[PDB]
Design an enzyme around this catalytic site. Sequence first.
Site, PDB file in Angstrom:
ATOM      1  CE  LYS A   1      -2.694  -6.300   1.307  1.00  0.00           C
ATOM      2  NZ  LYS A   1      -2.936  -7.648   0.767  1.00  0.00           N
TER       3      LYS A   1
ATOM      4  N   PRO B   1       0.837  -1.232   0.000  1.00  0.00           N
ATOM      5  CG  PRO B   1      -0.965  -1.596   1.473  1.00  0.00           C
ATOM      6  CD  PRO B   1       0.323  -2.228   0.961  1.00  0.00           C
TER       7      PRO B   1
ATOM      8  CG  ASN C   1      -9.150  11.443  -4.156  1.00  0.00           C
ATOM      9  OD1 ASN C   1      -8.490  12.419  -4.631  1.00  0.00           O
ATOM     10  ND2 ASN C   1     -10.395  11.526  -3.892  1.00  0.00           N
TER      11      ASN C   1
END
Lengths: 114, 114, 113
Positions: C32, C1, C97
């Site tokens: 993760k 990520p 976002n």
Amino acid sequence: PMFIVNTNVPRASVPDGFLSELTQQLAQATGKPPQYIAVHVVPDQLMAFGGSSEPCALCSLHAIGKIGGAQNRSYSKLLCGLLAERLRISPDRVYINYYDMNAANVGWNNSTFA
Amino acid sequence: PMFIVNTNVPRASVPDGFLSELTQQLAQATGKPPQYIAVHVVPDQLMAFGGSSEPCALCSLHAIGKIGGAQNRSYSKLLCGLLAERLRISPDRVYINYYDMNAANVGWNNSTFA
Amino acid sequence: PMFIVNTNVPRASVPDGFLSELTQQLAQATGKPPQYIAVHVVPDQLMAFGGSSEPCALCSLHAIGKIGGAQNRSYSKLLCGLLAERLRISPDRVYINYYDMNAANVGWNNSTF
């Protein structure tokens, strides 16, 4: 909505009112109140467009709806016009990526819009 | 197409000629004329990868088509190879996000590509 | 990520440890390993939110999966909390976002996932 402009034009060449002008103009174009509009301008960047270092801009516009074929053609006129006049960037040296965001994929105020 | 590289490597480590090289290599890889290639390199960034501040890069490649399984593997080899060779960034400390843009969502010179 | 935060807050206001914290908190939130978490903080930006220059942030979180309705609400709460507490940015002056990336569209280590 959120508009970001990345440019190699120096900071001193960005007018003081340019973020407010963008905010107002984008409010009118998107139909959203100015309070919902965020703008970000990133000058002095190391970039090239077509292998030339003349003034150029790499931009993005994100919004939840108000993104589409005809609307984007209209935004590109508005935005190339502002970048031409205020930053003196030739409109053929501008790219704007448009993103129609899903409400569930926009976070704000501890939550999302969904 | 547009290629952006964000990195904690200092500006002085970016070689003269890197933006031209990326423009030429991406034109060859994507099959698009160099005239439509934009490149943007952002050094001296405050970033970490895996919790470490060793050299790293967060990148993006946007194109209208020319984005897909095998093609992206090939771009990643190309791009990581350049970032390793020119900026001394280990390939395992690089992320490249690939975006297959719809022509209607790319503004350029007062219109879109649709 | 990968998490990126762009903000008009000055560099001196980013506390020592902030990138380590974001790494650890995002590892936990996404499930993760920290080794695969990338974080990028960009202070001193020229920006406005709602036509005001008070502290604000424009952010992005990209991950291969782990992006969705409920998860996104939980990330927003975590991240606005952190930006409020550490950077003194009001949560109503933050946009994040979220991007659910296809594995085939993420390059790493000379190849894609």
